Design an enzyme around this catalytic site. Structure first.
Site, PDB file in Angstrom:
ATOM      1  N   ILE A  11       3.670   0.458  -4.273  1.00 10.13           N
ATOM      2  CA  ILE A  11       4.503   0.472  -3.092  1.00 10.13           C
ATOM      3  C   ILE A  11       3.771  -0.165  -1.924  1.00 10.13           C
ATOM      4  O   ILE A  11       4.292  -0.187  -0.812  1.00 10.13           O
ATOM      5  CB  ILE A  11       4.669   1.863  -2.596  1.00 10.13           C
ATOM      6  CG1 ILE A  11       5.545   2.680  -3.504  1.00 10.13           C
ATOM      7  CG2 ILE A  11       5.248   1.856  -1.177  1.00 10.13           C
ATOM      8  CD1 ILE A  11       5.522   4.211  -3.105  1.00 10.13           C
ATOM      9  N   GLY A  12       2.543  -0.623  -2.128  1.00  8.83           N
ATOM     10  CA  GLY A  12       1.779  -1.168  -1.012  1.00  8.83           C
ATOM     11  C   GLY A  12       0.335  -1.447  -1.330  1.00  8.83           C
ATOM     12  O   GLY A  12      -0.362  -0.601  -1.889  1.00  8.83           O
ATOM     13  N   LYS A  13      -0.094  -2.659  -0.985  1.00  9.43           N
ATOM     14  CA  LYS A  13      -1.488  -3.074  -1.141  1.00  9.43           C
ATOM     15  C   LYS A  13      -2.171  -3.231   0.223  1.00  9.43           C
ATOM     16  O   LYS A  13      -1.560  -3.630   1.231  1.00  9.43           O
ATOM     17  CB  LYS A  13      -1.620  -4.303  -2.061  1.00  9.43           C
ATOM     18  CG  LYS A  13      -2.860  -5.181  -1.841  1.00  9.43           C
ATOM     19  CD  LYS A  13      -2.538  -6.468  -0.980  1.00  9.43           C
ATOM     20  CE  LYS A  13      -3.799  -7.181  -0.397  1.00  9.43           C
ATOM     21  NZ  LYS A  13      -4.642  -7.818  -1.472  1.00  9.43           N
ATOM     22  N   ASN A  15      -6.327  -4.030   1.953  1.00 10.65           N
ATOM     23  CA  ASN A  15      -7.526  -4.785   1.613  1.00 10.65           C
ATOM     24  C   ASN A  15      -8.361  -4.026   0.552  1.00 10.65           C
ATOM     25  O   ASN A  15      -8.659  -4.561  -0.530  1.00 10.65           O
ATOM     26  CB  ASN A  15      -8.346  -5.099   2.883  1.00 10.65           C
ATOM     27  CG  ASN A  15      -7.969  -6.449   3.510  1.00 10.65           C
ATOM     28  OD1 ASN A  15      -8.843  -7.302   3.741  1.00 10.65           O
ATOM     29  ND2 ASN A  15      -6.664  -6.647   3.788  1.00 10.65           N
ATOM     30  N   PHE A  16      -8.706  -2.771   0.863  1.00 13.98           N
ATOM     31  CA  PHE A  16      -9.520  -1.970  -0.043  1.00 13.98           C
ATOM     32  C   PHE A  16      -8.860  -0.646  -0.463  1.00 13.98           C
ATOM     33  O   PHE A  16      -9.533   0.270  -0.896  1.00 13.98           O
ATOM     34  CB  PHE A  16     -10.980  -1.788   0.457  1.00 13.98           C
ATOM     35  CG  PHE A  16     -11.211  -2.087   1.959  1.00 13.98           C
ATOM     36  CD1 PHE A  16     -10.360  -1.560   2.972  1.00 13.98           C
ATOM     37  CD2 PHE A  16     -12.330  -2.875   2.362  1.00 13.98           C
ATOM     38  CE1 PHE A  16     -10.611  -1.854   4.358  1.00 13.98           C
ATOM     39  CE2 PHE A  16     -12.591  -3.159   3.738  1.00 13.98           C
ATOM     40  CZ  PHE A  16     -11.745  -2.655   4.726  1.00 13.98           C
ATOM     41  N   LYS A  18      -4.816   0.849  -2.336  1.00 16.20           N
ATOM     42  CA  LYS A  18      -3.394   0.655  -2.735  1.00 16.20           C
ATOM     43  C   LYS A  18      -2.582   1.961  -2.829  1.00 16.20           C
ATOM     44  O   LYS A  18      -3.125   3.029  -3.085  1.00 16.20           O
ATOM     45  CB  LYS A  18      -3.221  -0.167  -4.045  1.00 16.20           C
ATOM     46  CG  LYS A  18      -4.439  -0.167  -4.990  1.00 16.20           C
ATOM     47  CD  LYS A  18      -4.113  -0.571  -6.429  1.00 16.20           C
ATOM     48  CE  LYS A  18      -4.070  -2.132  -6.680  1.00 16.20           C
ATOM     49  NZ  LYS A  18      -3.262  -2.577  -7.936  1.00 16.20           N
ATOM     50  N   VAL A  19      -1.279   1.879  -2.630  1.00 20.38           N
ATOM     51  CA  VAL A  19      -0.437   3.051  -2.792  1.00 20.38           C
ATOM     52  C   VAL A  19       0.484   2.812  -3.993  1.00 20.38           C
ATOM     53  O   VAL A  19       1.252   1.821  -4.021  1.00 20.38           O
ATOM     54  CB  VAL A  19       0.425   3.328  -1.531  1.00 20.38           C
ATOM     55  CG1 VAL A  19       1.244   4.556  -1.710  1.00 20.38           C
ATOM     56  CG2 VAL A  19      -0.424   3.519  -0.358  1.00 20.38           C
ATOM     57  N   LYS A  34      -2.338   7.409  -2.944  1.00 18.90           N
ATOM     58  CA  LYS A  34      -3.153   6.421  -2.265  1.00 18.90           C
ATOM     59  C   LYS A  34      -4.471   6.362  -3.015  1.00 18.90           C
ATOM     60  O   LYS A  34      -5.091   7.384  -3.221  1.00 18.90           O
ATOM     61  CB  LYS A  34      -3.352   6.826  -0.818  1.00 18.90           C
ATOM     62  CG  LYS A  34      -3.791   5.684   0.098  1.00 18.90           C
ATOM     63  CD  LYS A  34      -3.818   6.100   1.633  1.00 18.90           C
ATOM     64  CE  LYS A  34      -3.343   4.999   2.679  1.00 18.90           C
ATOM     65  NZ  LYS A  34      -3.762   3.591   2.316  1.00 18.90           N
ATOM     66  N   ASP A 127      -3.065   7.082  17.734  1.00 18.62           N
ATOM     67  CA  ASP A 127      -2.189   5.874  17.745  1.00 18.62           C
ATOM     68  C   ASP A 127      -0.946   5.995  16.909  1.00 18.62           C
ATOM     69  O   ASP A 127      -0.747   5.280  15.932  1.00 18.62           O
ATOM     70  CB  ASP A 127      -2.908   4.596  17.377  1.00 18.62           C
ATOM     71  CG  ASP A 127      -3.744   4.784  16.187  1.00 18.62           C
ATOM     72  OD1 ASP A 127      -3.734   5.939  15.672  1.00 18.62           O
ATOM     73  OD2 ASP A 127      -4.397   3.802  15.777  1.00 18.62           O
TER      74      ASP A 127
END
EC number: 2.7.11.1
Lengths: 302, 302
Positions: A11-13, A15-16, A18-19, A34, A127
């Site tokens: 579902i998502g990459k 840099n270091f 992934k999900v 994650k 944030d």
């Protein structure tokens, strides 16, 4: 080894990191997982990581994504968490235009509740941004090209003034911006670069959309106050009128976490059935271990 | 011919309210980039920026700043025809190949410094020099050019975060510092996972020295990355730096002096008379620096 989950899609990459979407084998339940490569991180990323883990273990609110397991190895860290299949609020907004005030309020009451809950645990987010507001299947808030995209518009003015940037009042300023985007479908402070952005934020003044109620506008002013030390607590804002329209029986209040249930006999017995020991169920939960035992137990809750 | 004298080939960039197309200038076959701006969708301040950027672009004539060949104005749409730099960004190059060896960084940095310094002698300051602004042409020379905040803060001078004026050429000086650091290290001297972290590093002003870096190079970094704005040297003074001039001993980098107006090239004048332009209109266009179809053709015959 994450043998107890079956990995489905990515579902998502990062840099270091992934999900992946995954299925928790014993319960069939879908989770997000994650997978972080720790060998690729520097000192400060590791501080932030360890801090995020500490924070995420302690938060238990129906509008903040829940942590179910953590699996540590020397090289790799796995965080198994709740999956919010609705994507982002940012996205939704761009697909649909603004939310009508009624809708904004349902969502915003959740957001304020989530963030105020953090504040009572002395956790400040620092944030909050578009990216961080996810949606579940039924469209409830769930709180989650480089790290600077989208970021400055949420910065509170003190960032640009050399002042300390660590109060909960910093989140208060961001919630302000969030309110404004929900109801207007754009940011109250923007520009073509940092310089322009900064002058707007520091001047603090923002365009009132013709359709906006005056109730909503008074609300915004309780958030978007230049002077940090003169910003209300979220707890005070919770009483705001606009915040409680249609909720006269039901003033938005500080979240009360519910008492621990570590002995649910429905779920205990079910697990005994899967071949866990009652002994380890107790240890894992009381110990707040976030191991596979505790992941199962939490997951049987859905 | 799709607009004035240009045939549009591919689209090489989309923006929310702007589009860049590759194009062939029919009379000369020369390739140009064509920025197509929809003014109907720009607000007040973006119009200010746009009009400023046009005034600026028309006045800059330097082998390492992309050249402007024509402006075409309509009530609704603005067309900027400029030189095309086909080598992509320096940002990208570095990511593809790693750091540059000092020798190569130097060839590209001398160009960059020269170009920026040229702007300062025209009292033009750029104010947000970044990775994306450094382009390469076919021969790999410097050509100076998800939202506007991506990759932005790492280039910001400390004064942004301190509430000070952010308008001097010394602001450019700070960013050139960062630029130098990226060229030889292949990474930013000041980074973080968010604004807060980023601001701490920037206001602290200290940065990692890569083991391979020369002491010449490091001394040169110190002349750019000085926290106190008023204590940063002119680029004209930095031009004299040792590292800047290694292998250029009979050839100290100096402020660029622009060639004198050639508005009367009899070769090109006559060629255009041939295409049925009048002598008188050619001179008017050039002397008056009109950037119309006549001047486009003249420059393009260059």
């Amino acid at each position: 080894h994450i043998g107890n989950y079956r990995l489905l899609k990515t579902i998502g990459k990062g840099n270091f990191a992934k999900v992946k979407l995954a299925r928790h084998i014993l319960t069939g339940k879908e989770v997000a997982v994650k997978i972080i490569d720790k060998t690729q991180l520097n000192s400060s990323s590791l501080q932030k990581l360890f801090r995020e883990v500490r924070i995420m273990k302690v938060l238990n609110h129906p509008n903040i994504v829940k942590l179910f397991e953590v699996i540590e190895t020397e090289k790799t860290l796995y965080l198994v968490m709740e999956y919010a299949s609705g994507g982002e609020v940012f996205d939704y907004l761009v697909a649909h235009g603004r939310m009508k005030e009624k809708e904004a309020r349902a969502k915003f009451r959740q957001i304020v509740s989530a963030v105020q809950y953090c504040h009572q645990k002395f956790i400040v987010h620092r944030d909050l941004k578009a990216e961080n507001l996810l949606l579940d299947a039924d469209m409830n808030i769930k709180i989650a090209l480089d790290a600077f995209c989208g970021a400055p518009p949420y910065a509170a003015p003190e960032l640009f003034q050399g002042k300390k940037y660590d109060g909960p009042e910093v989140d208060v300023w961001s919630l302000g911006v969030i309110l404004y985007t929900l109801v207007s479908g754009s940011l109250p402070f923007d520009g073509q670069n940092l310089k322009e952005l900064r002058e707007r934020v520091l001047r603090g003044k923002y365009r009132i959309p013709f359709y906006m109620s005056t109730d909503c506008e008074n609300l915004l002013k309780k958030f978007l106050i230049l002077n940090p030390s003169k910003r209300g607590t979220l707890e005070q804002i919770m009483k705001d009128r606009w915040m409680n329209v249609g909720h006269e029986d039901d003033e938005l209040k500080p979240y009360v976490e519910p008492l621990p249930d570590y002995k649910d006999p429905r779920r205990t017995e079910l697990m005994v059935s899967m071949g866990y020991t009652r002994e380890e169920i107790q240890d894992s939960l009381v110990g707040q271990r976030y191991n596979e035992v505790m992941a199962t137990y939490l997951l049987l809750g859905y």
